[PDB]
Amino acid sequence: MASETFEFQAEITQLMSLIINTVYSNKEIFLREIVSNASDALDKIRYKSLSDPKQLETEPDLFIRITPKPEQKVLEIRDSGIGMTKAELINNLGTIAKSGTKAFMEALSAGADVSMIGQFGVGFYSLFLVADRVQVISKSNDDEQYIWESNAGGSFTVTLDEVNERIGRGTILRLFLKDDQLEYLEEKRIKEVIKRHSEFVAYPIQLVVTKEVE
Amino acid sequence: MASETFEFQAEITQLMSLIINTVYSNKEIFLREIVSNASDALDKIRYKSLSDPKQLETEPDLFIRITPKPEQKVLEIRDSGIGMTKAELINNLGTIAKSGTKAFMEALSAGADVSMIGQFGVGFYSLFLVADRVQVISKSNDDEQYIWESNAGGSFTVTLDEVNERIGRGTILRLFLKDDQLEYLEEKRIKEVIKRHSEFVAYPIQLVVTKEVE
Numbered sequence: 241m242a243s244e245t246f247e248f249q250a251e252i253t254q255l256m257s258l259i260i261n262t263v264y265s266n267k268e269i270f271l272r273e274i275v276s277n278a279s280d281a282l283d284k285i286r287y288k289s290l291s292d293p294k295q296l297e298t299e300p301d302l303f304i305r306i307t308p309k310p311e312q313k314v315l316e317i318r319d320s321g322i323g324m325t326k327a328e329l330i331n332n333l334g335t336i337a338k339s340g341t342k343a344f345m346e347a348l349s350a351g352a353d354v355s356m357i358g359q360f361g362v363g364f365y366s367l368f369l370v371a372d373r374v375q376v377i378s379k380s381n382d383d384e385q386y387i388w389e390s391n392a393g394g395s396f397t398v399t400l401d402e403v404n405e406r407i408g409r410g411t412i413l414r415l416f417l418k419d420d421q422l423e424y425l426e427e428k429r430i431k432e433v434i435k436r437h438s439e440f441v442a443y444p445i446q447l448v449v450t451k452e453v454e
Numbered sequence: 455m456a457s458e459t460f461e462f463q464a465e466i467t468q469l470m471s472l473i474i475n476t477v478y479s480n481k482e483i484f485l486r487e488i489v490s491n492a493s494d495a496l497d498k499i500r501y502k503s504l505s506d507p508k509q510l511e512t513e514p515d516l517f518i519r520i521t522p523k524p525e526q527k528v529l530e531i532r533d534s535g536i537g538m539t540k541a542e543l544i545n546n547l548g549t550i551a552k553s554g555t556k557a558f559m560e561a562l563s564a565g566a567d568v569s570m571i572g573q574f575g576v577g578f579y580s581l582f583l584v585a586d587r588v589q590v591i592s593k594s595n596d597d598e599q600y601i602w603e604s605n606a607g608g609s610f611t612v613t614l615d616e617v618n619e620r621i622g623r624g625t626i627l628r629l630f631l632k633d634d635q636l637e638y639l640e641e642k643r644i645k646e647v648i649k650r651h652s653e654f655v656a657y658p659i660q661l662v663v664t665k666e667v668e
């Protein structure tokens with residue numbers, strides 16, 4: 241299964257190391273951005289389903305699910321939202337200019353809290369506060385399952401997915417956490433971050449935890 | 455306290471008797487539109503509060519509250535959302551052309567479900583399925599409390615509010631129910647309608663009920 245490679249729009253590349261190369265204190269904000277994005281994609285499929293009810297049948301349950309994979313130093317965040325086709329992944333996650341990218345960077349220079357990233361419509365890129373590599377695994381009703389992958393350099397890849405679990409519909413954000421941000425694999429830390437910043441979310445937030453039988 | 459009178463945009467007046475003069479079966483949909491509008495106004499104040507936290511201090515609790523007043527044949531639906539100033543009430547609730555009004559009426563003629571009214575951005579006017587008169591009582595952080603009132607004719611009034619309970623911030627939709635839609639004053643009916651159409655709402659929905667002490 242052959243990967244295709246794409247270049248990021250210049251300012252997005254600039255943003256990603258303005259982010260991956262911050263001191264910044266309040267790195268936990270990366271999870272509120274993901275949950276907020278997940279909730280929007282779930283909004284979209286629900287809104288779409290108003291006039292096309294069958295769109296929901298590929299995955300009738302509407303949820304956000306967080307799954308630590310400590311052996312792999314990975315945190316996953318799944319939603320059963322609208323998903324992205326191959327062309328959406330390429331268009332929406334890097335090739336096309338985002339309206340607020342340059343404005344956000346300008347605001348950051350002037351002293352804005354990184355927390356405002358969401359208000360500039362580029363909150364997706366905050367994942368690079370905690371992760372040096374990411375896969376977005378996504379299944380839209382309108383396409384096959386694909387994997388988009390980035391290590392914050394100037395190119396990303398998109399590959400037809402023949403290696404991951406089948407998602408009915410929606411997206412898995414798969415974060416390869418930095419060796420110093422491994423706290424985010426912990427059940428108590430996750431819970432704490434969710435209650436602080438994601439209080440008004442209309443969908444269940446599920447946490448998957450593994451325990452030894454004693 | 456002197457009322458001012460305003461004329462509705464022509465097509466809105468047309469819509470209001472296309473609605474108040476329907477047979478239509480599924481009139482319960484009027485409550486999902488109100489809850490959806492309440493949730494949006496709560497979204498707006500929360501979104502606004504991201505960069506102006508003090509906006510929330512006029513009413514720190516974020517809620518939708520439904521209160522039957524059977525003696526008056528009234529149903530109220532309150533939210534602690536962003537509210538509307540006098541100028542917003544005049545602009546947003548009747549004087550200015552809404553993008554979907556004529557399109558909705560055209561779709562209705564072709565056989566669309568009245569339920570689609572929300573998708574055309576004119577869902578507010580569905581209240582006239584069950585009510586022959588309405589007051590919108592509203593308090594924005596940016597203005598005094600005002601009352602907008604309509605009986606579905608071609609004019610509405612706006613009055614400085616010196617007669618209703620003070621709301622900290624937000625809106626009371628006060629419906630004067632038709633003599634044949636009094637079922638909507640009933641605790642069990644309300645509950646049933648809410649669970650069917652308002653399952654993914656991020657705010658608590660509170661129901662106020664009066665019971666005799668036995």
Ligand SMILES: Nc1ncnc2c1ncn2[C@@H]1O[C@H](COP(=O)(O)OP(=O)(O)O)[C@@H](O)[C@H]1O
Binds near residue numbers: 281332333360361
């Ligand atoms: N979980 C997801 N499901 C579907 N689409 C997504 C998801 N996460 C991000 N996207 C897409 O990426 C775009 C960029 O996300 P982001 O930078 O947070 O900006 P926005 O404010 O538009 O969400 C979104 O508009 C959306 O189309």
Ligand SMILES: Nc1ncnc2c1ncn2[C@@H]1O[C@H](COP(=O)(O)OP(=O)(O)O)[C@@H](O)[C@H]1O
Binds near residue numbers: 491546575576577579
């Ligand atoms: N509870 C409320 N609080 C504040 N504003 C409201 C409320 N209900 C309605 N509005 C205002 O009236 C407008 C018209 O409502 P509606 O016809 O449902 O269309 P929309 O799809 O814009 O909500 C809204 O955009 C909003 O500005």
